[PDB]
Amino acid sequence: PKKVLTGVVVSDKMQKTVTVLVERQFPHPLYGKVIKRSKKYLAHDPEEKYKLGDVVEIIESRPISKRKRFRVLRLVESGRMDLVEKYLIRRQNYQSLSKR
Amino acid sequence: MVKIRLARFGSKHNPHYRIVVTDARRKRDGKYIEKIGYYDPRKTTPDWLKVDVERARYWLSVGAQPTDTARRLLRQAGVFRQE
Amino acid sequence: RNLSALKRHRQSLKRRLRNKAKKSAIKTLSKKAVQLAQEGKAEEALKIMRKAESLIDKAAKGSTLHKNAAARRKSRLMRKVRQLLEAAGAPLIG
Amino acid sequence: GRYIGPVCRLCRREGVKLYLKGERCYSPKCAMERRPYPPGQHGQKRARRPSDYAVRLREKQKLRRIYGISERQFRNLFEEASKKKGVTGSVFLGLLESRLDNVVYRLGFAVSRRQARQLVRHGHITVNGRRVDLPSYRVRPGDEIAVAEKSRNLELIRQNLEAMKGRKVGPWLSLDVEGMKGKFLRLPDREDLALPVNEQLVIEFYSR
RNA sequence: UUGGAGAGUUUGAUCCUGGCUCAGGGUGAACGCUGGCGGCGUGCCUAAGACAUGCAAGUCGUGCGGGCCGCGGGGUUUUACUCCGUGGUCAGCGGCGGACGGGUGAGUAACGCGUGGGUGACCUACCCGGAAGAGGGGGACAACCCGGGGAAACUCGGGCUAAUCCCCCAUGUGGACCCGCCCCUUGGGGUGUGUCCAAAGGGCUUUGCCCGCUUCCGGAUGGGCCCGCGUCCCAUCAGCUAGUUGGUGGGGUAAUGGCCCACCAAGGCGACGACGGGUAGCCGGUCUGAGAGGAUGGCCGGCCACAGGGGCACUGAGACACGGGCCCCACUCCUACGGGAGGCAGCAGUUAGGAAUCUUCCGCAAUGGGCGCAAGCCUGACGGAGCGACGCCGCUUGGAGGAAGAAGCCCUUCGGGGUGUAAACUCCUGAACCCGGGACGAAACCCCCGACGAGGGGACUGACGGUACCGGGGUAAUAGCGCCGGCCAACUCCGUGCCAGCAGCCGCGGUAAUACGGAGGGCGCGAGCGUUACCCGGAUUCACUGGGCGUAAAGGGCGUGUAGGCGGCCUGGGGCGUCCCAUG
RNA sequence: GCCUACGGGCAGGCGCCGAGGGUAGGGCCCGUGACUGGGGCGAAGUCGUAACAAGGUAGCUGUACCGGAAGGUGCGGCUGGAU
């Protein structure tokens, strides 16, 4: 069963590619409470249809670019920046906390 | 070319074999495919050899040259008796 | 300080030269057939493509052409030809 | 070194009669008769209250020394006994009483436990048909622990059975003196044992 | 519910906090004292240091041609020269095997490994099955012969010649590629025209059977690539990245792919810890633990990684190839100083280093592997032996009787206590040792009959080993180490005198030492016992189980709010977490 | 040049990449080390008495300056100050 993940487009700067934020949930291997973790997959859009802030289903595909082995399945829920915003503010925060 | 052979399992002076099926190229005592009987050289137990012809037949069918000695045990089991 | 299982190297050389002349042979022929289609020599071009296709499949018979290898070469050649024969249509032979 | 040194001295260390020599440990002399004090230059001295450990200890030994068996086996047994479904203590005495060398003793084919050993190592013992020299061997229920045809006319053994006409055999055992045979019926029950020990202490000891 | 023991130690004394310590189990061990036996297992943990010697992969004359030595037979009236057959021997050409098996852990924190999946992105020698075919023509190179270079290793040139080596031509069951359509649905399948592609012979019991050969579909086994989850320490490492992230096209592969190139775009990753550094092959399992967890990952098995250091490709089903190749580098050795020759991390051994880790043994009988129609060849894979108490397990040094109790040694309140049934002595059994018998493991392939099927009959063949083991005969025949103040089972005397020394911790020793040193005695364990080192444990002393922060060590000097965590009542949908069933 | 059925193949040549080296500069880690801070230990000398009782000028403390020394003083804070 080729894997399927549901996530969100966060990046749309690339060519025919979209970065998808995929959230996963699970009990901590020892402490027990539900930890929420995530990963970004570089999906693949041929006809450049998928747009930022769209939730999509990812499916395991034939290797494409170095680190781009997934095609996008179908659009789940369109228009929902809400989530992006988070990813974004988190990224921005990164600018802080350093030795520059 | 997958063969059908024995596997050392006894010990120092206590050989106890294991009829199995595996790819030629593997070790004697290495990862086999489907264990189909064991044979006891010394014959201490009235049950010093078993087989399950049903599976034996599978292999040969699919193509699996058995060891000379190996075969001998399959013959004793009536692996090929067509009557 | 000897070992007769070296005859193999004594042999490999034989095949190195063997394979070599065949492989290159193809390259040349392909590269030949190619520049023909550029000029639009519908007749001869193929006259050559054909000598090509053969050579390829001939090495495929042996240990010179991996198998599907012949195939790729058969695709990458013919395709590169058909297309060029658009700059001046009508394939003479076939 | 499976012990073998001064004996009815241990009869003395424990303060309880240790039937280690048989005849004699019945005549006024397993020494406990007339010299109950323990050995040593301080035997006759007032003894201080024994630490929990001490009792747990002394009682292990009492068990052990009776069967006269190198701690290593003894502890091994106790280990094997913990792995069996049962009362961790009763089962202990189980194998403990199931050793070939012991059996012979209970069967009466010998004056004492010690004596029984030799009888075994020298091979005067049949077991379900074949001889056996390994005492530590475990006599399964329903085995004919006997005497070798060869050994039957023995000045020892003979004089022993002669005595048997006059003593009942353990309830879990049978024997046909007439033919010098004997069978091991079933594992003996704690209630059946006589031993002046308290397994509980023994068990309690092996958890330190 | 088959499962969980604590103690010493800060005080004049208490309680608490808290650390240190011990008892337990274990080891691929080492050192010390002692050391009889057998069975099974196991033995470089350190210099992946350097390595003499020997052996560790070859095999086919039922693929083809010959050289050396020799034998038998032919054509010769005879001689020289020759024709056939043949034994040994050599190597070549050609096929298969060398890509398995053996080692080792350096590297590696990584899709490397664990786990579960994908492959419409794949290959797969030999095996099995099913379908189809093997027609005609030609060629080269060793061996061999002639010559030249070199100290050597070896090398150059000229000429002959066979084949299941090579080439060409035809047939095409079929298969390939382009294009078109029909079905599917990422490069899956059907189909049409065009084009391209086959092949070797050998053996007999030779009018047929065996081995082998060609194209294709399928099988089986083996494997490449890919993805999700899992995967050590440091934040006194915080920002890393330029083929770097993506796109088009092209190359390259069995194949997807920045893997590689060109051009274009400007990206990609990072506190859910990027990058940097440190360390380590990973797992099944194993050790400990009541468990949760912690520790480990040698022997055995599975996967990876290297085969002096680094680079690279060839040949091939498969290698970027430990005992194949090309180059540079370090090192060793030959050298006529031009130039070469080497790689034990295979078995055994050598030396070095170290606390420390074995025999240059036996056998190819068995199991396995290769090559062979087979007989058979090779197999330091293996199966055995040997050395090491290095581990575990079994076993012995005897059994019974024997004094109100020898002697000696120890103690004493001098009367006696003790060592001690211990000894002596009595009888009995009888390890060692001696003689005889003597093994399974081994039944095949082969041969014969039968249809080289099934089935049945015959023959050969053991390293261990004259060993195990049975029978008979047969001697009373090794014991040692630690400890004895508390934890902690085991107490007296003497010597000593803060000395000599002990010591894990608290401590002990300045003339009365249950703590030093000997002795008598005693406890503990027994061919062993101690010691050191290291793991888990005790330690709920990193606390998920299962901790804390008023004064014991601990609340951030306060606020503000970012990420993030956490969140009120009723009803419904979805059901991701979550629970149940089946199944792989 | 070598071979050829003249289609073409080998030899050779050039080129890219490239192990490695050279020169310049930077960074980072190991060994040895002159010179040098303090530290902890231990019986114990020396000068003084800071702290512990209101320790005999209550103590403690951030800071600041000063001084054989411990410490004294200013300023602020605290009670973990006796009456």
Ligand SMILES: [Zn+2]
């Ligand atoms: Zn007695």
